[PDB]
């Protein structure tokens, strides 16, 4: 079935976080049934599993959209105008950061750093980096993304 | 190891944490440290000053030459800031707003809960911790508590005054409650003034031990309750009963003894240790306008004193009363009842009328005419009053926010034809009498220090209307109680220190914790009460319940006589009205560590203001409430439930400011399986986790722990029973117990509060006459159940030996051979029992190996024989091991059986049964023997109405 | 003859368009029927000049900058076939004299740089262990296997190597504490959980040269006695994880990892633990709890990780940069390492020049170089010639150093004195267009997000400090807010349990210390840098306006010759697309 991956991992409590990462790879999020089978296999309380899963910002309990927009709010991007580009993205898309659109097209996320601090205003859309972003340019990129291009 | 704490030399254990030793020698705050867990650094309140810097003492290990300052300025500031940070995210009320509205700060919630239970004597006992005349207050108080009530935000405030009147009259009728007087302190206090303030000072100084003498000018005690308050509001038989309850405590009354005429203040100081001046304001203020000397200008207090004393009062047909206080209203209604057409003139509006509003509405019904914003300017007549000149007034400028002052409207002068003018514009004490005795007063009101209530003379205190001017009975009783507190502090030498502590307790914390009196006074007079800003939107979920209406006497009939206009409520409406309380106060207010620390460190709630985390209360569980709004995030519940109980009921959720405690997302506490859910109520330090109590209203009471054992099984776990005047509130966990924790069976099933009332014969309850007949007729072999203490077993065994009756017990086998050390040290165990039926085995066997071969200790369920390895034989009766030790095993053979205790497996027995009750476990005293062979003591929570010893004779 | 063509394929290169350039090079080599070796390299450090294409002759390397796909045919035709370098695009030259590589660059970026950790990055193929062997690698591993483990510890403690991930605890002492601890099973951890928002040096080492970290870990494990090694890298760094897995496979199959490593009887295995992502999990105790499957909540220090760490067994947790320094110390000697840097801080430090600096990238500077040299000779100053107001050193944990204190040498104590810390190695340059209150608010916002919420001081005081900063920024502040900040920040520093909260008030403290005039100007309702949204008003200059209306079709809120102040979203796109001096950001007063 879908939950076969759990038994490849060692039934020690230390395997929880790798198992959570494997679950979020397999399903895109953390389902309840998978979490209870993880708690059963590792013999850890389900409250411990939920505390670990809610501690880390990687894990979410609802599936992600098609286009994931990652706004870098590191120091280099912030001093070069990350607030203005996030304002442009939020105003064009219509959701705040950390939310999914109702149709599930655009998921908006905030990330720490992407390594390209020289392209200081930088976002990432599905592992593709767009850099040197004035608010107008990122509005153009969002509008071109919405119409099925890119 | 030698460490230096605040300059002194100390020897401490090396392995143990420093916080334990420091809390042994001094006071160290801290939420999150429990010795069963490793040190946790979450509360950050146990800070000490080391040579390296400021660090937490729960993590430090005692080292050689370590010097630690526990109370320095920086440490006080750091703890204060930490407490203010915690309070900035705290949501809840320590006390209900009813207690803050009462000038005497009475536990309104507690005695309303006691009234809802039907315990009126206990409710009056709780009332008398803050005031002394609950019937008088139920009749005449302006009900400041009902103004502040949180029921004002939903429908209608609780009838606190009328419920208090009902309970107080029940106590006066069905036997009055009198307090306990401690041994004499050897001190004498002179009290001047037989009014409510003097009575309160005398009562609360008598309840401390000092011998009190009351001096009063009038022939009777009561003051303006007897000579100023009319008898249609306060009947004098009720006043006599209430004052009798105050005076029967041992107060020496000297009536018809005045100050300045019979005894001077200097003689009073030389003969008595402290003197309280509550002479009251018995002079009436003149108006100063010309013509005030005309015949027909009576003063309100003199007129009401003549009417109350029965003296001949001459009154005309038209009477004008000037003033707007309670004095004016009583003058107006008394003059209406004597036969006069009464008009009351007040210089302000109706809203700013100081009078009791219920009395004003009653007077408007009875036909008293009011004209507000009017002021008399002149009284016109040859020798007697014929007419009075009045000027219309308007509100003036707001000035320095002084609620404006009435300024006359020029040209609006009008004349009213009247026969008598009664002056009720205010009261004061005689200024010349105050100069005769030497007390510093301004405008006739005595100047006293606001904290200590002390005059310019040493040993002289003041209160009542002498200090507050025209005031209330409850405010006078508050001043009297505070003066009793301050007189007791003055007689020990601690008054100056206490005043400094009450001004700023954060600078004298060492003296506060070192002195019992300073701690008590600080927590009585300046406690930290946490508040929430609630509007009407926060009580929309509450059921709308109507307030009780008491049928007043007919206005047309009551305008002619001096019969009491308001009766007492009927007893059927009392419970219905008392059950409307929303119990706004915190259930943990008497044991919450956060409130105590905020009291000691002078923490303000508004020091840091921002956004708080808003949570919904999780009260779906039948017995336990979880309130994350009162969670200080110490982690003790998580540490217990994951590292000691292994149940994992709750855990930390989310990160940072959004962190809270709860089950897995999508489930509440009702879905969580665990027999140690109720231990979290004792684990929590502040009151985020609380227990639902099996009473109608759970209102927090000052319960006293009682050390006893549980009767759920052979473990006989040590516990505290929380008792409040014969009420078995809850079972809690002792720290000094061999088990430390108790299960949800003991807490929530309460086997210690269970007893069958009457003997059962063949499945039907019978009276004791039938039991005596059965005992006399049949052979009645004696079968003992394991619910009896060791002394009872000895008594029953000796009775059987003396009389020859065959004796046995339902329990058979041999006792356990293992000790708690053996179970603690062994690692491979044989478990032939169900783990769920003996819940402490879950805690005792954590991490052990459950094997079937090569074991070290064995756990078997009785009846059984000891095995080769040290065995743990577990029965279902607490004193099963005591029965096995005394040698009363087996069921002997006979015709009919009398069994002492309703134990199961008695249906296996052959014949006919007489089940005699064994009694309440909580009402029992003696020792028991539990599974591990310990002899554990049982103590009485309350007096026993049944004993098995006298039943058998 | 052109031996090889190399394209920089780090995360910074990949983001700039290095995949497109690499594929264009492959297409051009295939089209021209050329037989040159196409290899990938890491990052040399010129992140501002990327994508970088290196043409490797046997004796010289010619590195071209800004190599887009369309520039590739020109470069290929003119250089690899005709043989004429295009000197306009040549940004870097490397030549060998007496076995030491010498560097020339257009910008003088490398002049003040001594590369100890990044000596191989941008020259070797990170996915080919043969290239790293040919560059002198893993010779230090054989040399360390020759000597005794305690001799290795003495070598490390005599070089003055201090921890590059934090406070700078001496590494030899840490190794000795892990070796002297009682126990038969011990672990080592490589901390690659760089949670600093502005730090990219650790992933730079793990992507451009992972075998350096692997070799350092093996040397340290031999010295300490560890059986298992953990590389704690985030799952947000997939390229680093991929290259680490490739490198681990190649080192295992060649006998450097496994059982009986090079005949020493020493069994060592390295396993990559993927961190889920939290700034607090970079803390030692939180990292231990995260590997063990718990929440990343730190615990008090008197039980130290070097004596009771992973599952109770002793653990040595060191940074990627420290492990990368170890092979250089073993190969070149401890005296060579002690011949660099100040008296107390030895060696070299890797900094990340970011923000408003012109030559941003990864710099390898010796300890004791002055801050002004890094900011002006290596960084080139600001990108528009403006003055530098301050630098943020240490990320959110460190503080702002102003321009009159730029003479401070970058050693541990000289930076600790000013109220900053060396921290991760992040250097963010702030200019005249930067509001220091906004910077402090950003750092406190990050701290509020990343706190684990265990101790009362961090969890509550960071939120209260951030609320005070937001109050001051919105203009609704007063002097009492500044006094509350000045009282609260030292207490949050003194009372917090872990280093996140103990370094949390550092930005606020430093900004108050050096830039209190900006705070007092925000009390009066004005932003001297025109950054805060409510304190700035976008005003239109009518006398300097034009009828072309360039800043009229780009505005999405429709607040434009006249500005609708009641409807302005305050994005600021007017000031850039106007291509004329008409829009002026002015105080709303
Ligand atoms: C007309 C009237 C109506 C009121 N109605 C209400 C009401 O409806 N509700 C309400 O809550 N309160 C009412 N009050 C207030 C009520 O009287 C309060 O209890 C009052 O504040 C009592 O103050 P006290 O403690 O000073 O006692 P007092 O009543 O002032 O007692 C004074 C006592 O001191 C004695 N004394 C006086 N001078 C000397 C002296 N020189 N030496 C020795 N003894 C002396 C007097 O004989 C008397 O026993 C009313 C008061 C008045 C006057
Ligand atoms: C909040 C916080 C984040 C940290 N992040 C890192 C990190 O990303 N990388 C790192 O090497 N050390 C980090 N540290 C420091 C570690 O706790 C520890 O000191 C470090 O691993 C020691 O490295 P060293 O052996 O080279 O001295 C962090 C510390 C704190 C308090
Ligand atoms: S938890 Fe403590 S401090 Fe908070 S409201 Fe309840 S009693 Fe007061
Ligand atoms: S004395 Fe008055 S204010 Fe106080 S509780 Fe009783 S009725 Fe309420
Ligand atoms: S509802 Fe009860 S507890 Fe709350 S204010 Fe009213 S009387 Fe007090
Ligand atoms: S619920 Fe109580 S015990 Fe648990 S963390 Fe909160 S305050 Fe502490
Ligand atoms: S384990 Fe048995 S004796 Fe102990 S508390 Fe529970 S029911 Fe009572
Ligand atoms: S300082 Fe912050 S991150 Fe560190 S333990 Fe305390 S609350 Fe957690
Ligand atoms: S602001 Fe500039 S672009 Fe806009 S209308 Fe004026 S001149 Fe034209
Ligand atoms: S600043 Fe932005 S929102 Fe305001 S007018 Fe210009 S483009 Fe429009
Ligand atoms: S700060 Fe955003 S890419 Fe580095
Ligand atoms: S920090 Fe020591 S008791 Fe909480
Ligand atoms: Zn780069
Ligand atoms: Zn600003």
The domain tally of chain B equals: 6
Please check whether residues C268 and C408 belong to one and the same domain.
no
Q: Quote the CA–CA distance of C239 and C220 in Å, as a whole number.
A: 25
Beta-carbon contacts of C285 under 8 Å, excluding residues fewer than 6 positions away, are: C298, C299, C301, C305, C498
Please check whether residues A139 and A92 belong to one and the same domain.
yes
Q: Quote the CA–CA distance of B181 and B206 in Å, as a whole number.
A: 7
Pocket test for ligand 3, best of B96, B529, B594, B631 (most atoms within 8 A of CB): B594
Please check whether residues B674 and B553 belong to one and the same domain.
no
With respect to residue B902, please indicate whether it lies within any of the assigned structural domains: yes
With respect to residue C132, please indicate whether it lies within any of the assigned structural domains: no
- Rg of chain B in Å (alpha carbons): 34
Q: Is C461–B85 a contact, with Cβ atoms under 8 angstroms apart?
A: yes
With respect to residue A103, please indicate whether it lies within any of the assigned structural domains: yes
With respect to residue B812, please indicate whether it lies within any of the assigned structural domains: yes
Neighbours of B628 (CB within 10 A): 20
Please check whether residues B155 and B231 belong to one and the same domain.
no
Please check whether residues C147 and C284 belong to one and the same domain.
yes
With respect to residue C128, please indicate whether it lies within any of the assigned structural domains: no
Report the residue from A48, A50, A55 with minimal CB separation from B655: A55
Neighbours of C562 (CB within 10 A): 9
The domain that contains B632 carries what CATH number? Answer: 3.30.70.20
With respect to residue B441, please indicate whether it lies within any of the assigned structural domains: yes
Please check whether residues C173 and C262 belong to one and the same domain.
yes
Please count the CA atoms within 13 angstroms of the CA of B945 that sit on its side-chain side. 6
Beta bridge partners, B916, equal B900
Beta bridge partners, B213, equal B190, B252
E strand intervals along C386-510: 388-393, 399-402, 426-431
Residue B10, classified by CB atoms within 10 Å of its CB into exposed (0-12), middle (13-18) or buried (19+), is: middle
Please check whether residues C211 and C301 belong to one and the same domain.
yes
The domain that contains C394 carries what CATH number? Answer: 3.10.20.600
Please check whether residues C162 and C307 belong to one and the same domain.
yes
Q: Is B426 left (phi over 0), alpha (psi -120 to 50) or beta?
A: left
Please check whether residues B669 and B649 belong to one and the same domain.
yes
Please check whether residues A79 and A51 belong to one and the same domain.
no
DSSP for B602-655, written as a single string: T--TTSS-SPPPP---B--SSSEEE-GGG-----HHHHHHHHTS-----EEESS
> DSSP label at B538?
G
Q: Are residues B374 and B368 in contact, defined by beta-carbon separation less than 8 angstroms?
A: no
Please check whether residues B779 and B886 belong to one and the same domain.
yes
Beta-carbon contacts of B887 under 8 Å, excluding residues fewer than 6 positions away, are: none
Please check whether residues A6 and A41 belong to one and the same domain.
yes
Token pair recorded at residue C150: 């305690």
Domain boundary among the residues B753, B771, B801 is at B753
Sign of CA dihedral B132, B133, B135, B137: negative
Residue whose pair of structure tokens reads 């350039």 in the numeric block? C21
The domain that contains A79 carries what CATH number? Answer: 3.40.30.10
Distance B590 CA to ligand 3 centre (A): 9
Please check whether residues B866 and B924 belong to one and the same domain.
yes
Q: Quote the CA–CA distance of B372 and B119 in Å, as a whole number.
A: 45
Q: Is C65 helix (H, G, I), strand (E, B) or coil?
A: coil
Domain boundary among the residues C398, C413, C431 is at C431
Distance B568 CA to ligand 1 centre (A): 25
Residue B372 main-chain phi, psi, to 5 deg: -85, 165
The domain that contains C36 carries what CATH number? Answer: 3.40.30.10
Residue B738 main-chain phi, psi, to 5 deg: -70, -20
With respect to residue C342, please indicate whether it lies within any of the assigned structural domains: no
Report the residue from C361, C430, C573 with minimal CB separation from A79: C430
Q: Are residues B574 and B581 in contact, defined by beta-carbon separation less than 8 angstroms?
A: no
Q: Is C197 left (phi over 0), alpha (psi -120 to 50) or beta?
A: alpha
Q: Is C295–A134 a contact, with Cβ atoms under 8 angstroms apart?
A: no
With respect to residue B516, please indicate whether it lies within any of the assigned structural domains: no
Residue whose pair of structure tokens reads 């110390």 in the numeric block? C329
Residue of B700, B697, B684, B694 whose CA lies nearest to B628: B684
Please check whether residues B708 and B788 belong to one and the same domain.
no
With a 6 A CB cut-off, is B594 part of the ligand 3 pocket?
A: yes
Which residue CA neighbors atom 7 of ligand 7 most closely? Answer: B712
With respect to residue C353, please indicate whether it lies within any of the assigned structural domains: yes
Q: Is C354–A135 a contact, with Cβ atoms under 8 angstroms apart?
A: no
With respect to residue C155, please indicate whether it lies within any of the assigned structural domains: yes
* Residues after which a C–N gap over 2.5 Å breaks chain A: none
Domain boundary among the residues C316, C336, C356 is at C336
Q: Is A48 helix (H, G, I), strand (E, B) or coil?
A: helix
With respect to residue A62, please indicate whether it lies within any of the assigned structural domains: no
State the maximum Cα–Cα separation within chain A, in Å, rounded to a whole number. 53
C572 touches A at CB < 8 Å: yes
CA distance C308 to chain B (A): 14
Strands C388-393 and C426-431: antiparallel
With respect to residue B591, please indicate whether it lies within any of the assigned structural domains: no
CA distance B81 to chain C (A): 8
Q: Quote the CA–CA distance of B851 and B857 in Å, as a whole number.
A: 10
Distance C569 CA to ligand 10 centre (A): 6
Please check whether residues B787 and B924 belong to one and the same domain.
yes
Q: Quote the CA–CA distance of C332 and B746 in Å, as a whole number.
A: 72
Which positions in chain B touch A55 (Cβ < 8 Å)? 652, 654-655
Q: Are residues C377 and C358 in contact, defined by beta-carbon separation less than 8 angstroms?
A: no
Please check whether residues C170 and C274 belong to one and the same domain.
yes
Domain hosting B405: range is: 300-335+344-425
Which positions in chain B touch C461 (Cβ < 8 Å)? 81, 85
User: H or E element: which one contains C312?
Assistant: none
The domain tally of chain C equals: 5
Please check whether residues B919 and B784 belong to one and the same domain.
yes
Please count the CA atoms within 13 angstroms of the CA of B615 that sit on its side-chain side. 23
Q: Quote the CA–CA distance of C448 and C431 in Å, as a whole number.
A: 25
Pocket test for ligand 2, best of C162, C163, C178, C191 (most atoms within 8 A of CB): C191
Please check whether residues C151 and C290 belong to one and the same domain.
yes
User: H or E element: which one contains B357?
Assistant: helix B357-366
Which of C9, C11, C15 would best serve as a mutation to test chain A binding (most A beta carbons within 10 A)? C15
Beta-carbon contacts of C490 under 8 Å, excluding residues fewer than 6 positions away, are: C505, C509
Please check whether residues B905 and B773 belong to one and the same domain.
yes
With respect to residue A14, please indicate whether it lies within any of the assigned structural domains: yes
Domain hosting A24: range is: 2-55
With respect to residue B864, please indicate whether it lies within any of the assigned structural domains: yes
Please check whether residues A142 and A72 belong to one and the same domain.
yes
The experimental technique behind this entry is: cryo-EM
Q: Are residues B322 and B345 in contact, defined by beta-carbon separation less than 8 angstroms?
A: yes
Domain boundary among the residues B578, B595, B628 is at B578
Please check whether residues A50 and A94 belong to one and the same domain.
no
Measure CA B70 to chain center: 33
Q: Quote the CA–CA distance of B27 and B13 in Å, as a whole number.
A: 18
Residue whose pair of structure tokens reads 């310019």 in the numeric block? B456
Domain hosting C62: range is: 2-121
DSSP for C297-309, written as a single string: ----SSS-TTTS-
Q: What is the resolution of this structure in A?
A: 2.8
Please check whether residues C449 and C302 belong to one and the same domain.
no
The domain tally of chain A equals: 2
Q: Quote the CA–CA distance of C151 and B472 in Å, as a whole number.
A: 89
Q: Quote the CA–CA distance of C283 and C247 in Å, as a whole number.
A: 26
Please check whether residues A86 and A115 belong to one and the same domain.
yes
With respect to residue B86, please indicate whether it lies within any of the assigned structural domains: no
Beta bridge partners, B733, equal B719
Please check whether residues B782 and B658 belong to one and the same domain.
no
With respect to residue A60, please indicate whether it lies within any of the assigned structural domains: no
Q: Quote the CA–CA distance of B307 and B299 in Å, as a whole number.
A: 12
**C221 to each of C117, C185, C216, how far by Cα in Å?**
19, 11, 9
The domain that contains C169 carries what CATH number? Answer: 3.40.50.11540
Q: Are residues B47 and B29 in contact, defined by beta-carbon separation less than 8 angstroms?
A: no
**C374 to each of A78, B217, B281, C362, how far by Cα in Å?**
22, 93, 84, 11
Q: Quote the CA–CA distance of C62 and C45 in Å, as a whole number.
A: 15
With respect to residue C478, please indicate whether it lies within any of the assigned structural domains: yes
With respect to residue C7, please indicate whether it lies within any of the assigned structural domains: yes
Please check whether residues A45 and A81 belong to one and the same domain.
no
Domain boundary among the residues B733, B753, B773 is at B753
> DSSP label at C374?
I
Beta-carbon contacts of C111 under 8 Å, excluding residues fewer than 6 positions away, are: C377, C378
Domain boundary among the residues C277, C310, C336 is at C336
Token pair recorded at residue B55: 């660090």
With respect to residue C530, please indicate whether it lies within any of the assigned structural domains: no
Please check whether residues C164 and C288 belong to one and the same domain.
yes
């Amino acid at each position: 079935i879908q939950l076969e991956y759990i038994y490849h991992y060692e039934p020690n409590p230390s395997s929880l976080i790798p198992l959570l990462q494997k679950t979020q790879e397999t399903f895109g999020y953390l389902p309840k049934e998978a979490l209870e089978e993880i708690s059963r296999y590792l013999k850890v309380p389900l409250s411990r599993v939920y505390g670990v899963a809610t501690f880390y910002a990687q894990f979410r309990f609802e599936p992600l959209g098609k286009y994931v927009i990652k706004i870098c709010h590191g120091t280099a991007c912030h001093v070069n105008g990350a607030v203005n580009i996030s304002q442009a993205i939020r105003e064009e898309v219509g959701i705040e950061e950390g939310q999914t659109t109702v149709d599930g097209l655009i998921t908006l996320e905030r990330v720490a750093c992407l390594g390209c601090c020289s392209l200081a205003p930088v976002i990432m859309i599905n592992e593709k980096v767009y850099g040197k972003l004035t608010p107008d340019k990122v509005r153009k990129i969002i509008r071109n993304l919405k119409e099925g291009k890119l | 190891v030698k460490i230096t704490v605040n300059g002194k030399e100390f020897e401490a254990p090396k392995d143990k944490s420093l916080i334990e030793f420091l809390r042994e020698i001094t006071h160290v705050p801290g939420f999150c440290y429990t010795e069963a867990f490793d040190p946790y650094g979450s509360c950050r309140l146990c800070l000490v000053q080391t040579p390296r810097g400021i660090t937490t003492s729960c993590t430090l290990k005692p080292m050689e030459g370590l010097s630690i300052e526990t109370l320095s300025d920086e440490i006080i500031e750091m703890r204060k800031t930490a407490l203010e940070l915690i309070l900035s995210d705290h949501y809840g009320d320590c006390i209900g707003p009813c207690q803050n509205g009462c000038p005497a700060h009475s536990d309104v919630q507690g005695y309303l809960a006691l009234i809802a239970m039907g315990r009126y004597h206990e409710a009056v006992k709780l009332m008398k911790e803050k005031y002394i005349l609950p019937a008088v207050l139920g009749r005449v108080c302006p009900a400041f508590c009902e103004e502040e009530c949180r029921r004002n935000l939903v429908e209608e405030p609780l009838a606190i005054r009328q419920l208090k009147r009902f309970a107080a009259d029940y106590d006066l009728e069905n036997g009055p409650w009198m307090p306990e007087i401690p041994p004499s302190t050897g001190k004498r206090i002179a009290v001047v003034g037989g009014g409510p303030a003097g009575l309160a000072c005398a009562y609360y100084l008598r309840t401390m031990g000092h011998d009190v003498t009351i001096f009063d000018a009038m022939p009777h005690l009561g003051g303006m309750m007897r000579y100023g308050i009319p008898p249609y509001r306060l009947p004098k038989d009720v006043l006599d009963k209430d004052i009798a309850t105050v005076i029967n405590t041992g107060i020496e009354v000297k009536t018809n003894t005045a100050l300045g005429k019979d005894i001077a203040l200097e003689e009073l100081r030389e003969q008595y240790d402290a003197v309280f001046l509550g002479v009251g304001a018995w002079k009436s203020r003149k108006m100063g306008i010309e013509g005030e000397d005309l015949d027909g200008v009576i003063h309100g207090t003199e007129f009401l004193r003549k009417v109350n004393m029965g003296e001949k009062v001459e009154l005309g047909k038209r009477v004008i009363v000037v003033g707007g206080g309670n004095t004016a209203m009583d003058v107006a209604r008394t003059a209406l009842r004597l036969g006069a057409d009464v008009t009351v003139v007040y210089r302000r509006s109706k809203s700013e009328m100081p009078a009791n509003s219920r009395e004003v509405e009653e007077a408007e019904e009875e036909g008293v005419k009011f004209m507000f914003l009017t002021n008399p300017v002149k009284i016109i007549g040859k020798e007697k009053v014929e007419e009075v000149e009045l000027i219309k007034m308007k509100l003036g400028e707001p000035d320095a926010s002084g609620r404006r002052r009435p300024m006359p409207i020029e040209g609006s002068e009008f004349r009213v034809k009247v026969d008598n003018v009664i002056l009720a514009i205010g009261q004061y004490c005689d200024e010349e009498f105050l100069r005769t005795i030497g007390i510093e007063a301004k405008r006739g009101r005595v100047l006293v220090d606001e904290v200590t209530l002390q005059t310019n003379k040493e040993g002289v205190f003041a209160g009542g209307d002498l200090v507050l001017g025209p005031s209330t009975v409850i405010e006078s009783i508050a001043t009297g109680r505070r003066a009793a507190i301050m007189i007791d502090l003055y007689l020990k030498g601690k008054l100056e220190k206490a005043r400094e502590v009450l001004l700023d307790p954060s600078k004298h914390i060492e003296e506060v914790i070192y002195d019992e009196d300073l701690y008590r006074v600080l927590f009585d007079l300046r406690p930290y009460n946490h508040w929430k800003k609630v509007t009407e939107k926060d009580y929309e979920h509450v059921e709308r319940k109507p307030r009780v209406k008491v049928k007043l006497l007919d206005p047309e009939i009551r305008k002619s006589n001096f019969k009491e206009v308001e009766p007492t409520m009927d007893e059927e409406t009392v419970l219905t009205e008392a059950q409307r309380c929303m119990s706004c106060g915190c259930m943990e207010v008497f044991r919450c560590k956060l409130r105590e620390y905020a009291t000691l460190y002078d923490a303000k709630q508004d020091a840091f203001v921002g956004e708080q985390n808003k949570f919904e209360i999780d009260e779906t569980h039948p017995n336990v409430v979880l309130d994350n709004n009162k969670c200080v995030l110490c982690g003790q519940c998580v540490n217990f439930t994951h590292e000691i109980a292994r149940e994992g009921i709750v855990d930390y959720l989310f990160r940072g400011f959004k962190t809270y405690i709860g089950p897995q997302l999508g489930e509440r506490l009702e879905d969580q399986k665990g027999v140690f859910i109720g231990e979290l109520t004792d684990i929590c330090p502040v009151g985020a986790i609380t227990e639902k109590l099996p009473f109608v209203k759970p209102g927090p009471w000052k319960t006293q722990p009682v050390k006893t054992v549980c009767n759920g099984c052979s473990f006989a776990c040590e516990m505290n029973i929380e008792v409040y005047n014969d009420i078995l509130v809850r079972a809690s966990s002792r720290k000094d117990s061999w088990n430390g924790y108790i299960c949800d069976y003991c807490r929530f099933e309460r086997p210690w509060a269970q007893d069958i009332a009457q003997p059962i014969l063949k499945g039907n309850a019978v009276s004791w006459e039938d039991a005596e007949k059965f005992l006399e007729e049949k052979e009645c072999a004696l079968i003992l159940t394991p619910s009896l203490t060791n002394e009872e077993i000895m008594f029953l065994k000796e009775l059987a030996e003396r009389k020859g009756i065959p004796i046995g017990s339902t329990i058979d086998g041999e006792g356990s051979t293992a000790t708690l050390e053996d179970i603690r040290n062994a690692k491979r165990v044989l478990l032939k029992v169900n783990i769920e039926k003996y819940p402490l085995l879950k805690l005792l066997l954590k991490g052990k190996e459950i094997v079937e071969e090569g074991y070290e200790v064995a756990i078997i369920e009785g009846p059984a024989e000891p095995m080769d390895v040290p065995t743990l034989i577990l029965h279902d009766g607490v004193n099963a091991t005591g029965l096995i030790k005394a040698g009363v095993t087996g069921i002997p053979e006979a015709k009919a059986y009398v069994v002492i205790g309703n134990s199961p497996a008695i249906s296996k027995l052959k014949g006919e049964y007489l089940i005699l009750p064994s009694g309440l476990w909580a009402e029992k005293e003696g020792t028991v023997t539990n599974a591990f062979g310990m002899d554990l003591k049982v103590k009485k929570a309350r007096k026993a109405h049944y004993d098995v010893k006298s039943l058998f004779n | 003859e052109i031996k090889a063509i190399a394209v920089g394929m780090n995360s910074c290169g990949i983001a700039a368009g290095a995949r497109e350039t690499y594929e264009a090079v492959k297409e051009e080599l295939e089209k021209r029927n050329l037989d040159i070796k196409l290899k990938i390299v890491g990052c040399v450090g010129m992140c501002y000049r990327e994508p970088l294409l290196d043409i490797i002759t046997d004796n010289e390397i010619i590195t071209y900058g800004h190599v887009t796909p369309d520039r590739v045919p020109r470069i290929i035709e003119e250089h690899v076939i005709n043989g004429k370098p295009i000197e306009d695009w040549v940004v870097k030259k490397d030549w060998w004299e007496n076995g030491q590589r010498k560097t020339w660059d257009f910008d003088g970026y490398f002049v003040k740089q001594k590369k100890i950790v990044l000596e191989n990055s941008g020259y070797i193929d990170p996915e080919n262990i043969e290239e790293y062997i040919a560059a002198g690698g893993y010779e230090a591993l054989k040399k360390a296997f020759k000597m005794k483990p305690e001799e290795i510890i003495d070598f490390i403690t005599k070089s003055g190597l201090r921890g590059r991930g934090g406070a700078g605890f001496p590494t030899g002492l840490k190794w000795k504490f892990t070796r002297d601890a009682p126990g038969d099973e011990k672990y080592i951890v490589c901390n690659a959980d760089e949670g600093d928002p502005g730090a990219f040096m650790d992933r730079n080492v793990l992507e451009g040269d992972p075998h350096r970290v692997i070799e350092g870990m093996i040397i340290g494990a031999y010295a300490i006695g560890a059986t298992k090694g953990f590389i704690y890298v985030r799952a947000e760094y997939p390229l680093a994880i991929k290259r680490l897995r490739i490198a681990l496979k190649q080192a295992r199959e060649k006998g450097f990892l496994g059982e009986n490593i090079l005949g020493s009887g020493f069994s060592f295995e390295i396993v990559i633990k993927e961190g889920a992502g939290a700034f607090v999990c970079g803390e030692e105790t939180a990292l231990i709890a995260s590997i063990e499957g718990k929440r990343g909540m730190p615990r008090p220090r008197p039980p130290y990780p070097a004596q009771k760490g992973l599952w109770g067994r002793p653990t040595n947790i060191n940074n990627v940069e420290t492990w990368a320094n170890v092979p250089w110390i073993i190969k070149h000697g401890w005296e060579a390492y002690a011949a660099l840097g100040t008296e107390k801080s030895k060696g070299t430090k890797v900094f990340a020049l970011s923000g408003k600096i012109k030559h941003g990238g990864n710099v390898e500077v010796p300890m004791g170089i002055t801050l002004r040299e890094i900011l002006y000779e290596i960084g080139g100053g600001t990108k528009t010639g403006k003055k530098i107001k301050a630098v943020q050193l240490g990320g959110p944990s460190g503080g702002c150093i102003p321009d009159y204190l730029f003479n401070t040498p970058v050693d541990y104590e000289s930076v600790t004195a000013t109220g900053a810390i060396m921290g991760s190695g992040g250097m963010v340059v702030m200019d005249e267009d930067t509001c220091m209150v906004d910077v402090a608010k950003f750092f406190l916002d990050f701290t509020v997000k990343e706190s684990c919420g265990k101790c009362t001081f961090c969890r509550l005081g960071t939120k209260r400090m951030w609320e005070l900063l937001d109050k001051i920024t919105k203009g609704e502040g007063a002097l009492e807010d500044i006094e509350k900040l000045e009282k609260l920040a030292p207490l949050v520093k003194t009372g917090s349990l872990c280093g996140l909260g103990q370094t949390a008030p550092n930005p606020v403290l430093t900004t108050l210390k050096y830039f209190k005039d900006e705070y007092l100007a925000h009390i009066e309702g004005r932003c001297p840098a025109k950054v805060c949204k409510p304190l700035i008003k976008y005003v239109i200059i009518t006398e300097k306006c034009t009828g072309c209306t360039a800043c009229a079709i780009m505005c999405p809120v429709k607040a434009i010759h006249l500005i609708n102040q009641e409807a302005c979203i305050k994005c600021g796109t007017c000031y850039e697309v106007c291509r004329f001096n008409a829009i002026e950001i002015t105080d709303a007063k």
